[model samples]
Target: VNSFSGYLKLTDNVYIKNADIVEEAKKVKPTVVVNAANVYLKHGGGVAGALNKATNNAMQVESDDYIATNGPLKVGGSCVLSGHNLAKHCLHVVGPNVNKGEDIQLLKSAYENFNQHEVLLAPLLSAGIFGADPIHSLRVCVDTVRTNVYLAVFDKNLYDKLVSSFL
Candidate 1:
């Protein structure tokens, strides 16, 4: 953690780190890969306005990528805060339970496409682990994650490494 500056990050990752989340709203990818976030974050009326702002604003010149929102946006306090209305594949994945295990499997399946800094943490909620309550409110506020870190899982062994964090 001492030398965060030494890390090599993709150019887009740098932009997302800053509040200028709307800069690249001009160009939309073929498919938007949402890591996992709450529902409200996906389509919370005006709650997730910034992402859509970038999306609608993008139509000014660039094309829009498909929107994909994961996690249960309806489960009380979980929401995207932004970046919900534009995702093409808006997947609702409820975690910490066995019922959505299949969904989680599918989400992780996307990990196969993750190259360097491919997926960013847009959990919007704390821990990126989707809980319905606000138990980690203070922690979520104090901890501000700026960088867009991605994880690549090409096989079961690689997937297991990341999944262990949840356990």
Candidate 2:
């Protein structure tokens, strides 16, 4: 419990937290929590997978609806969905998969696209299912955000490595 409360600061407005993503999402109650989705907006794995379970797959349904109307969500683009378990809204960002090149700029764009909100919860983009380096992904997420950012990290060891690298 105590371990989950610890966080590493990347900037005055950005933090890397070692905690359960879903639990932290409820605790922080950010304006929105960003989901790293695929082109089809499937929430089958990674942070998206966990959120799908937490929200009773409502976010997945929302993503499908957004896709049904707007076509496949592209990288650097996002769709906002009503929240269920914690956040008031969920910001779904279509990011790269393992087949695609690791495009940090595109990931950064995804974060930048939602500039209207003052607080956002994000994950280590491209680091999980996409297989991008966690350190690089964390750097891109921190660098692109102008608002307060909370990174819900599930792997403390990996996060510690990232924190050490950043320091």
Candidate 3:
């Protein structure tokens, strides 16, 4: 861990790293960070829960826009939060769940809709709460991530192998 392994350079600006997503957000200080959430926006667990706690629940309040949907937002759809404690803004998007088949295209659409920003922090979009395997989710994300996005992971080996593949 002493030497920096380096990140996967997906594009001029987009890079993938195996690190703590939340910690990366605190360090890079992206203009916007994504919260892998469902339509309810409870912020009660997972990344959403941690981010909600970080911002002192303001994010949960800002997520009212999703209530009417009663489920997940459309692919490429999101709610924005401003003046947040960690980042200037946060984008909330619902990743694919078990009941819904793995729709890589839809996830790609969601990634497409992210507003332009110098830096963006995101997790494995549909791998966790949605029940999709991380490897598959990572693959979909690698294929669909845009030119200015950042993907953060928790395992160094996974990060190294993924970047190695792009070679």
Question: Could you tally the backbone clashes for each prediction?
Answer: 17, 0, 1
Off by over 4 Å in 2: 1-5, 101-104
C-alpha positional error of residue 132 in candidate 3 after TM-score superposition, expressed in Å: 1.8
- The number of clashing residue pairs in model 3 is 1
The segments of candidate 3 whose C-alpha lies over 4 angstroms from its true place after superposition are 1-6, 11-13, 65-72, 99-105, 115-118, 156-161, 164-167
Q: How close is candidate 3 to the true structure, as a TM-score?
A: 0.75
lDDT value for model 3: 0.67
RMSD per candidate (Å) reads 12.7, 3.2, 4.5
Q: Is candidate 1 or candidate 2 better by lDDT?
A: 2
Native-referenced Cα lDDT, model 1: 0.29
Off by over 4 Å in 1: 1-16, 25-47, 57-167
lDDT of each: 0.29, 0.76, 0.67
Write the residue-wise lDDT of candidate 1 on 1-167 in tens digits: 22122222333332112212223222332123233333323432221234445456442122122234242333322211223334443222222222333232223322222222233432222222232222232122123223343222223442343344321
The digit string of per-residue lDDT tens for model 2 on 69-154 reads: 98887777877788777688888777555557746567677767557678777776777777777887777776777877778778
Question: What TM-score fits each model?
Answer: 0.27, 0.87, 0.75
What's the TM for model 2? 0.87
